[model samples]
Target: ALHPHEKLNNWGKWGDDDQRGAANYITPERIVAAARLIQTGKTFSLAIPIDSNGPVFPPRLPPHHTMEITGADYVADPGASPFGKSPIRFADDYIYMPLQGSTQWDALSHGWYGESLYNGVPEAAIRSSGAGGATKLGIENVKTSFLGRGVLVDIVRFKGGSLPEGYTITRADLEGALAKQKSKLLPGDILVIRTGLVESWYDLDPVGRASFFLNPMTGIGSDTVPWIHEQRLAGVAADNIALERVPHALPVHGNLLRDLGVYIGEIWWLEELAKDCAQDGRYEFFLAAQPLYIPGAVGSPLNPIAVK
Candidate 1:
């Protein structure tokens, strides 16, 4: 029952060689319709800061920023400096971090349970390359498809923020929250859920944040996969480590990314957006996010923006 609803799989829906997966659903008509949701002209950045303070899963290190060139060098030795008499000095730095260490989008090649990926791109064809790292089904395949309508389902606010750890949010909760906000799903929309799990970490001590990834986290349950498939969504995102509940038995990533070609975005900073949406009574907005064109990488950091 790994792929229990195989009949609903979106593999090859566009054609045998399709790589963008469900992203193809975001047609020009849908994009135009979504633009009409903008009313207030307010904007929100739905991304956490990418730094050493951010949460990291086990075995993955946080981001490290180091300066490649600094003005201190000129002060130490003016004669040896490259810009000796130029009167102009600049600084530059480089970052060393895991691409998926912070808020990120999982490409269609990020998860697969069998020998094939989305659109049946065989595992053998997914070999490593230099920049992209993936030979097939990489993030670059759908980098330009993230702009669309995003529906916010703030479960935390709707439930009074008392949901315990390990809670598995079901389809009923999703529908309940939307109904409360008077919002409804539409084809090609990006479904964004807010659980307040990551939002809680901002108050925790540094040591407590270290163990955030090891703890049992609360998120959407696997039972809602069928409903997601039925909804014909282009993608799903949430304000948590993973969109689905941790420690669950279901191969949640595989089911969505591999079976339906629906991208998964996690670790989004949704507090600002949630607050504004609740106050304005507008749960739908224009979401604009573009992943770095990392050639074959299975995932890339994201900075999603919600405009209304």
Candidate 2:
């Protein structure tokens, strides 16, 4: 069996002269180089729905997700309430409500490192506000552009829309799809997967939408994680609520968000995109997606776009 060190030679640091080393060597510099390739392409966004009509489930719980960016106005009138209508509405006519209602990006601060926040910044940074790294890596830190090869894995078509209820897609699903499509997975490529659930939720009533959150296996599973790691994808995206299903009643949140530095995009509009690609027998595209960079938040609502 290959030793752990041997297996990781391709991923982590290795000791060797310039020419004698693992065939695949990745580092921050390598990632940047990959990003350059993507940037060279004419960029366009693929995100959808971050407005008043964004997904709203039955349970309107605390910390409501994205809010409508209707024109904001400050109520100078004493009788006029300032809560609903901003006194300074004219500032940005339509502003998204954090993660609730828009195409936004999640800073590392969005998800907690257990009790700790991103970059080990102190809690006070978050509490104090005013954009501090200690608080969260706000959208400001995110570069507006993403340049890379884009790979779309049509899980719905691959499975013929017959994925078992509570099914956990393994690496095999990804590999099989690529083989069937005669496509090759490349490092730094954006990986998009379609599970057919996005349409179902879009068609569901509020109650039906709520039921989706209750399901156990909502996102990609641990088995597929290795595939992600191996691929060294620039990002992993899906057209499902929360991306991976809620496995074991716990979201893949810990695995993808915290463990891996990879970014996750949920509720992407890939059904139509994938359909078009399949019909054309072309699986690659120039993928672009950006999220609202709200610092110190758990997640953002982003509408990513895939341009072929």
- Taken over the whole model, the C-alpha lDDT of each candidate is 0.84, 0.54
Q: Give the per-residue lDDT digits (tens) of candidate 1, residues 1-308.
A: 35554665887689998889999989888889889988878999999998888777768898878887787877786644454456677677899988878998989888887788888888877675644367888888877888989999999988986578878899899989899899999999999999988878878797787677677899888767888889999899988887889862546787898889999998899988988987889999998977898888888998899999
Question: Where does candidate 2 stray beyond 4 Å?
Answer: 1-45, 56-92, 100-104, 116-136, 247-251, 293-301
Model 2 collision count: 38
Q: What lDDT score goes with residue 259 in model 1?
A: 89
lDDT of 1: 0.84
Model 2 compared with the native: what TM-score?
0.68
Stretches of candidate 1 off by over 4 Å are: 71-85
State in Å the error of residue 198, model 1.
0.8
lDDT of 2 by residue, 169-247 (tens): 7688889988998888776676888776656655777776666667654457766765676776656777665666654
Instruction: Identify the candidate with maximal TM-score.
Output: 1
Worst 10 residues of 1 by lDDT: 78-87
